[PDB]
Amino acid sequence: ETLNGGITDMLTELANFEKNVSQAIHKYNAYRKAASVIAKYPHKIKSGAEAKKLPGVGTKIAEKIDEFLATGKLRKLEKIRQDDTSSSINFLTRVSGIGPSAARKFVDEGIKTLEDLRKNEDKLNHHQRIGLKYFGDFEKRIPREEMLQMQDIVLNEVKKVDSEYIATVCGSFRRGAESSGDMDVLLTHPSFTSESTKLLHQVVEQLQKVHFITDTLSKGETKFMGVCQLPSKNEYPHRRIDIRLIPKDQYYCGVLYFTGSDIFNKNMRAHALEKGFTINEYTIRPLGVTGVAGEPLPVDSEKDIFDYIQWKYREPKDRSEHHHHHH
DNA sequence: GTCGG
DNA sequence: GCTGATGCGC
DNA sequence: CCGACGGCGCATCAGC
Numbered sequence: 454e455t456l457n458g459g460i461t462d463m464l465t466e467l468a469n470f471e472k473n474v475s476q477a478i479h480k481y482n483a484y485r486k487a488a489s490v491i492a493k494y495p496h497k498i499k500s501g502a503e504a505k506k507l508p509g510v511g512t513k514i515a516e517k518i519d520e521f522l523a524t525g526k527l528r529k530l531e532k533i534r535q536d537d538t539s540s541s542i543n544f545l546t547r548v549s550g551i552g553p554s555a556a557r558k559f560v561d562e563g564i565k566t567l568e569d570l571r572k573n574e575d576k577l578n579h580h581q582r583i584g585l586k587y588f589g590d591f592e593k594r595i596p597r598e599e600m601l602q603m604q605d606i607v608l609n610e611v612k613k614v615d616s617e618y619i620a621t622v623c624g625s626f627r628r629g630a631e632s633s634g635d636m637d638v639l640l641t642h643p644s645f646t647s648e649s650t651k652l653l654h655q656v657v658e659q660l661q662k663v664h665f666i667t668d669t670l671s672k673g674e675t676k677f678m679g680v681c682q683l684p685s686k687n688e689y690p691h692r693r694i695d696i697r698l699i700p701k702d703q704y705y706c707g708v709l710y711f712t713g714s715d716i717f718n719k720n721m722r723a724h725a726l727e728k729g730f731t732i733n734e735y736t737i738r739p740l741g742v743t744g745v746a747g748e749p750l751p752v753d754s755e756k757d758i759f760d761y762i763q764w765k766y767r768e769p770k771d772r773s774e775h776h777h778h779h780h
Numbered sequence: 781g782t783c784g785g
Numbered sequence: 786g787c788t789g790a791t792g793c794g795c
Numbered sequence: 796c797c798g799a800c801g802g803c804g805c806a807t808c809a810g811c
């Protein structure tokens with residue numbers, strides 16, 4: 454199935470360990486980068502040397518690849534898997550609301566299992582209460598077929614609140630994925646621009662009023678994080694939904710951001726820094742001589758952003774990650 | 781952990 | 786109130 | 796203790 458899959462899984466496992474157990478956020482990103490680059494490499498890897506040529510594979514990862522190529526495993530990962538404290542910390546971070554820091558506190562207080570975690574609800578904040586409540590459903594992927602029915606509801610209900618709203622389903626759906634992990638809804642309204650001043654609320658209560666949104670993780674004036682569910686013919690899993698209100702006049706920088714992937718975005722924002730610019734979901738600005746962002750540059754399309762940084766435009770579908778296959 | 785300066 | 790970290794997530 | 800690594804919304808606490 455997956456060309457070099459053994460290696461990329463290995464590197465993914467290490468990344469997760471550095472993040473969740475070591476709290477080494479930059480080592481985590483080194484391994485992710487490594488995993489991404491190898492996955493998109495179109496040849497089989499014969500050695501750590503070969504791999505090392507790829508940007509973001511260095512000495513220590515080559516070594517590991519050698520070890521893995523030679524033995525079909527990695528001793529560093531055997532020791533880690535066996536370490537039950539590492540394994541429970543890792544596990545707890547898969548609940549939404551719990552990161553490396555809380556997962557560690559919980560495990561050092563004898564909370565190690567799903568069963569233990571439910572026993573100690575009173576220890577959890579609201580966000581964690583809800584991620585635990587839907588832990589199972591949130592592990593499932595969303596078929597594009599079901600994404601369409603959700604778009605239909607979201608779009609219809611936005612129009613019914615105020616037809617001047619425009620709602621756009623971004624994330625992995627806009628990239629054409631046949632399944633998505635969540636639903637990312639990007640929202641504009643002409644009253645909200647970068648120079649103006651309860652636009653997101655209305656939409657959320659409307660979506661709750663017709664019982665599509667079922668819970669709330671967090672909510673502010675511009676970003677809503679919650680749970681949703683299709684009505685049953687006769688039940689559908691609950692699902693994560695992200696609703697983002699961005700300023701009407703910065704739609705392109707915002708839709709670029711909200712389309713992802715995550716890895717595409719940090720690579721893009723990294724390539725810009727070396728060219729001399731800084732990008733966020735609102736603007737692309739030139740970095741001053743002192744690394745200080747200057748005034749925003751004009752953007753009339755997604756391609757204008759790529760253009761400023763001397764990148765070839767890439768349609769949404771080519772902003773996903775890929776892997777390659779062996780026979 | 782990698783890169784680069 | 787304000788600012789500024791830290792934790793968490795996308 | 797070579798240093799930067801993407802960038803920021805929401806929740807919370809700390810120090811003023």
Ligand SMILES: Nc1nc(=O)n([C@@H]2CS[C@H](COP(=O)(O)OP(=O)(O)OP(=O)(O)O)O2)cc1F
Nearest residue numbers: 624625633634635710711712713714715718795
């Ligand atoms: N680290 C991240 N940086 C980003 O810019 N993003 C952006 C913000 S919103 C857009 C989509 O994020 P999601 O986490 O919903 O990821 P996705 O839709 O690509 O993937 P999925 O199908 O939701 O698993 O990507 C996400 C990150 F995780």
Ligand SMILES: [Mn+2]
Nearest residue numbers: 454455776778
């Ligand atoms: Mn495949």
Ligand SMILES: [Mn+2]
Nearest residue numbers: 454455458459
């Ligand atoms: Mn294989």
Ligand SMILES: [Mn+2]
Nearest residue numbers: 492493494495
């Ligand atoms: Mn490739």
Ligand SMILES: [Mn+2]
Nearest residue numbers: 561562563564
């Ligand atoms: Mn205890």
Ligand SMILES: [Mn+2]
Nearest residue numbers: 624625635637
């Ligand atoms: Mn998504």
Ligand SMILES: [Mn+2]
Nearest residue numbers: 635636637695
């Ligand atoms: Mn999302």
Ligand code: NA
Nearest residue numbers: 505507509510
């Ligand atoms: Na390299």
Ligand code: NA
Nearest residue numbers: 546548549551
């Ligand atoms: Na988590």
Ligand code: NA
Nearest residue numbers: 572573575576
């Ligand atoms: Na308790």
Ligand code: NA
Nearest residue numbers: 587590690691
């Ligand atoms: Na459920």
